[PDB]
Paper text:
We therefore set out to obtain a full-length structure of a mycobacterial [name] and we successfully solved the MsmCoaBC structure, which shares very high sequence identity with the M. tuberculosis orthologue (86% full-length, 84% CoaB enzyme) and hence is a valuable tool for studying M. tuberculosis [name]. Here we report the structure of the bifunctional [name] of [name] at 2.5 Å. The final model (residues 2–412) covers both CoaC and CoaB, but densities for several residues in three loop regions in CoaB are not observed (residues 290–298, 336–342, 363–376). The N-terminal CoaC of MsmCoaBC (residues 1–179) forms the same type of dodecameric arrangement seen in other HFCD family proteins, such as the peptidyl-cysteine decarboxylase EpiD18, and it sits at the core of the dodecamer with the two domains connected through a small loop region (residues 180–189) that tightly interacts with both. The active site of CoaC sits at the interface between two protomers of one CoaC trimer and a protomer of an adjacent CoaC trimer with the FMN site facing inwards towards the hollow centre of the dodecamer. Each CoaB of MsmCoaBC (residues 190–414) dimerises with a CoaB belonging to an adjacent trimer. The full protein resembles a tetrahedron with CoaB dimers positioned at the six edges and CoaC trimers at the four vertices. The shortest distance between a pair of CoaB and CoaC active sites is ~30 Å. The absence of dimerisation for the MsmCoaB when expressed alone suggests that the interactions between CoaC and CoaB in [name], and likely all other Mycobacteriaceae, are fundamental for CoaB dimerisation and activity. The organisation of [name] is similar to other HFCD family proteins but unique in the sense that it contains more than one domain and highlights how the arrangement of the fused enzymes is essential for mycobacterial CoaB dimerisation and function.
However, in the vast majority of prokaryotes, including M. tuberculosis, CoaB and CoaC are encoded by a single gene to produce a fused bifunctional enzyme ([name]). [name] converts 4′-phosphopantothenate to 4′-phosphopantetheine in three steps. The product of CoaB is then decarboxylated by CoaC, an enzyme of the homo-oligomeric flavin-containing decarboxylase (HFCD) protein family, to 4′-phosphopantetheine. Transcriptional silencing of individual genes of the CoA biosynthetic pathway of this pathogen identified [name] as uniquely bactericidal within the CoA pathway, highlighting it as a good candidate for drug discovery.
Residue numbers in the entry:
A (entry chain B): 3 to 150, 158 to 290, 302 to 335, 343 to 363, 377 to 412
B (entry chain C): 2 to 151, 154 to 291, 300 to 364, 377 to 412
C (entry chain D): 2 to 150, 157 to 290, 300 to 333, 344 to 363, 377 to 413
């Protein structure tokens, strides 16, 4: 259960944010060794990383040579996380440099490698960085899309920790395969009002919707995410946020952005009905099916971009295979998980995290779009 | 003059003390050696060791003795640059084109053959960045030796080849700059080498005086040019296993043919350079004044006939070896072409106890030189033939 | 465990990069090795090198790790201390009883065997201060390897030699007394090659190791050794041993003839072939002839007073064994399939171990026989 993680820290202003990544990985029961660059010590000192990780902090290969630390750290690692990954670090990782303990450890690691780049937009968008990021991606490393006045800010420490424990559970979880895919996602419970202060709502976290949006984003999809009431979820890096209120405001937001979308995933738990009298200081009216309405602009001919629609269902193997054909979605998800597509294929989602399940969902979407 | 100027670059690997004997052997062979270590190499082996072994000063940066314009004169005057060990860091700097210490600045300056001898932990060696860099150095004209694998649990490639292997591959490039193109990639080659031992008893036996140097040389040259080489060796003159070849040790000629028949199906090229014993001893006792002899099987003929009977499909080139002393009944090329059509070989190496003859009709006079230089002429023709077939 | 603890000390000679191969070899043999360099050795080989090979920390003075009592525990837990190279300066400090760095402090506290492998320029080695210091260390119970051979003596012996002798002292502490000073010895080793024609021949699977061992142990105990070698398993010349190679068994007979006069000990350890082929073809069924018993030829000349100086002859290869010695005429006989029979009837069972170990027993028996007539 307790995995061995290396946390590489390169020399960026965001280095103090790695402290939080180390503390959380440690709180989750994991064994963390911090390997900073020399230039990271100009930002956070070895003492801080030594107290948070509980293990010694060294920057070069020529210390504790008797314990062969330049190979053993990488050979025994279950994951390598670099946060922040500077342009310089990425440039060295691509070149295959091994001139400090962090880059030598990268060459030795035969485990998943997660870069969380952080830098100024101009650096991130410079053609050397762009090619370097592409090369690391095609070599099998995960390079998180940074957050956004432009792109380049380090993703929040929770997003990095979550994606780290994801790769610990499933090494192939985040291939850079959904490039060029545009995706509108919905998540969170909607709030149907009856008062400028009071309302009716439900208990959905939004986590699985957010999880699916995050996994799409970190696999290359240009994601747009319309959220309602969430369990205080913070926005995923690189996804465009559109916050909404009512189950009606959800519909308008969908039909505002859905034409540009290539893929749409209804994870929102929209409430069935809706009140009709809103006193400014029990008259319900049943709300429209936003998912089912999408399949119809589908047919009526104004979604010549849409190539996949996925639905979420609440708990029976065969009892649900009817719902996908009836609802007209390209595939449907349900957990008491099981995934069912419109080609008859069905698979049971082995138990896991909302993000781990989100990867199975995003896998089944990629396969569907291949079959076209 | 036969005295060449060698630059020995030493990068920061555990193997740096092995570079010491490399410089000792090259100076003992009359060459003039300048050692250019990286700064990290100095934490493994001291400058004083290299100054005493080479007799020349040892510096790591370009800003020393800039009056003697050493950052260019050191490269401009070298006949060979050898890097041993070449670390993953150093290969990466050479590929990027860095010139930030004296060694890498010498690499941009040198116009002579350039020999890297990598040494690393296997995981560094198989890392995609390392393998891309090795490919780029090779496409750019450098020779990058395939490392050794010397075990049980911590085996795998990445070990520095033995100094003798490095020094004799260094001398090869001093003699022939184009000796080691990476051209045999994708071919599997089976090589026999050495003499055989035909037992009279457990203790005594009949044998010949074969050193094995010929076959080992072609195995080595094949390995260092890309081939996945297997080497069936009998008795040799204490020859170290070449870097990157699978080794199989046999005692007798019967034991050789069983070993050849065991590995020939996976092979693309077979090199019969082993001096195989013509006749055996009739009775093998168990302890100890006229001993009878029985003829052994012609394993080389055994392979061509099995090939013509469809039992060796992926076999594409069978090269035999022949010893020669003078020509009277015809010329040497006349009798060799007859020996080549009769045995069914694709290539015949006639040893002047050089001549290279080919089933395509090619013939070539091998000039005198080192056994390893002759192996490159041989491997050239094995390549030339495979292009034809 | 068979895992013994070895201290390899390294002093500041050009030969320090050769100690790296000693450390690796002792480590491949399963032992735990702690390298203790002098400060001036770090000018030649870095601490980082010795750390990667030894797998153990590398320190140079006594004040590091004072908590885990290293100034003393490094010596009093060692099973062997080998110094390679041992410079003149190190030998002088060891004789003085200096302890001003970790290596010298370790030497004063060790109670196991101590093996010095000196290496230096010949003028340093033959300077009277060094000569005296080498004699004091030998007198005091240390083993000081005679170094190898500009062309003079003082080269570090090969690593394989040092590790061989290191593992020998791990098996027998008293194995290399400096007892055979002045003795002229001549040894034969290896198999022999009787040619049929210029390229073919008939050989035997003799390694030469057992004969090389006896020549090595003799030279490192004080003797001047001439080794006549046949076909060996690619063996390296022992340091301090005039080498003479031979081919056929008559070429050996010819070689023992030239050199046996000057000698005081003959160790007929070669596996000489008894039969030679009928004729050399210079290019069926092979008839053969017989070769001279070299050992029996050797006892005859001694018996006819042709070898005045030779005081001991040893043969090789105890039901009929005691009779074999009396029939051979040899002074001692080594029987392997060990047992060592003497020319005064006393026999001893050489408990089988390393070849070099039983070589020290063979030299033991030679030593007692030479002191018999002294
Ligand atoms: C205050 C400050 C903040 C920096 N932030 C970043 C950054 O966020 N990303 C980046 O690539 N470089 C950043 N740099 C530049 C790096 O310090 C520089 O590239 C350095 O060599 C670190 O690389 P390394 O940690 O991989 O060795 C910053 C520099 C300074 C002075
Ligand atoms: C004990 C030890 C052994 C090492 N061995 C190697 C090696 O064999 N190959 C390698 O590429 N790197 C090795 N390294 C990593 C290098 O020391 C490091 O990459 C160094 O910066 C290489 O730089 P250079 O280009 O100056 O050699 C080793 C490091 C240590 C501590
Ligand atoms: C390149 C060089 C090689 C040397 N080699 C030896 C040597 O092999 N033996 C020796 O006794 N002194 C040698 N010396 C001289 C010194 O005595 C030696 O390096 C050092 O001072 C001895 O100190 P130590 O006790 O640490 O060995 C050498 C000096 C140099 C500069
Ligand atoms: N007002 C609503 C309510 C539900 N949804 C969508 O409908 C699906 C689930 O509704 P349904 O087809 O009725 O199946 P259930 O799981 O039973 O519905 P519920 O959410 O109430 O559990 C989800 O994909 C959700 O996006 C919708 O379109 N608009
Ligand atoms: N029993 C044997 C003996 C020889 N060979 C192969 O055949 C070649 C030489 O056979 P041979 O006809 O005896 O060669 P010659 O032309 O007579 O020259 P020489 O024997 O002196 O080498 C060598 O390549 C050897 O590898 C073989 O396969 N089987
Ligand atoms: N031609 C020979 C053969 C034997 N020896 C010596 O004799 C010893 C071996 O004894 P040996 O009598 O040859 O052993 P056996 O196998 O019994 O041989 P033999 O028929 O002679 O008894 C060795 O020291 C060896 O060097 C010798 O001097 N010359």
């Amino acid at each position: 259960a307790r995995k061995r993680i290396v946390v590489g820290v390169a020399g960026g202003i965001a280095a103090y944010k790695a402290c939080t990544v180390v503390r959380q990985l440690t709180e989750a029961g994991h064994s963390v060794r911090v390997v900073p660059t020399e230039s990271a010590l100009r930002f956070v000192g070895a003492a801080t990383f030594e107290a948070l990780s509980g293990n010694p902090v060294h920057t070069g290969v020529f210390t504790d040579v008797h314990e062969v630390q330049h190979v053993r750290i990488g050979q025994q690692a279950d994951l390598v996380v670099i946060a922040p990954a500077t342009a310089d670090l990425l440039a060295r990782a691509v070149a295959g440099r091994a001139d400090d303990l962090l880059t030598a450890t990268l060459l030795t690691a035969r485990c998943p490698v997660l870069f969380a780049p952080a830098m100024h937009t101009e650096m991130w968008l410079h053609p050397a960085t762009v090619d370097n990021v592409a090369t690391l991606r095609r070599r099998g490393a995960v390079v998180l899309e940074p957050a956004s006045s432009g792109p380049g800010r380090l993703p929040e420490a929770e997003e990095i920790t979550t994606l780290a424990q994801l790769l610990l559970e499933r090494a192939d979880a985040l291939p850079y395969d959904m490039a060029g895919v545009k995706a509108l996602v919905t998540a969170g419970g909607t709030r149907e009002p009856l008062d400028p202060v009071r309302f009716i709502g439900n208990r959905s976290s939004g986590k699985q919707g957010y999880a699916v949006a995050r996994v799409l984003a970190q696999r290359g999809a240009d994601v747009t995410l319309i959220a309602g009431n969430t369990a205080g979820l913070i926005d995923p890096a690189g996804v465009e946020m559109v916050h909404i209120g009512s189950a009606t405001q959800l519909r308008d937001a969908v039909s505002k952005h859905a034409p540009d979308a290539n893929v749409l995933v209804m994870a929102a738990a929209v409430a069935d009905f809706r009140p009709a009298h809103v006193a400014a200081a029990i008259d319900l009216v049943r709300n429209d099916d936003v998912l089912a309405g999408a399949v119809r602009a589908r047919a009526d001919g104004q979604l010549p971009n849409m190539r996949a629609i996925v639905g979420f269902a609440a708990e029976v193997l065969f009892h649900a295979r009817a719902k996908l054909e009836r609802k007209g979605c390209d595939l449907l998800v349900v957990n008491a998980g099981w995934l069912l597509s419109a080609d008859g294929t069905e698979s049971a989602l082995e138990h896991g995290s909302k993000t781990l399940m989100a990867t199975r969902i995003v896998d089944s979407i990629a396969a569907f779009l291949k079959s076209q």
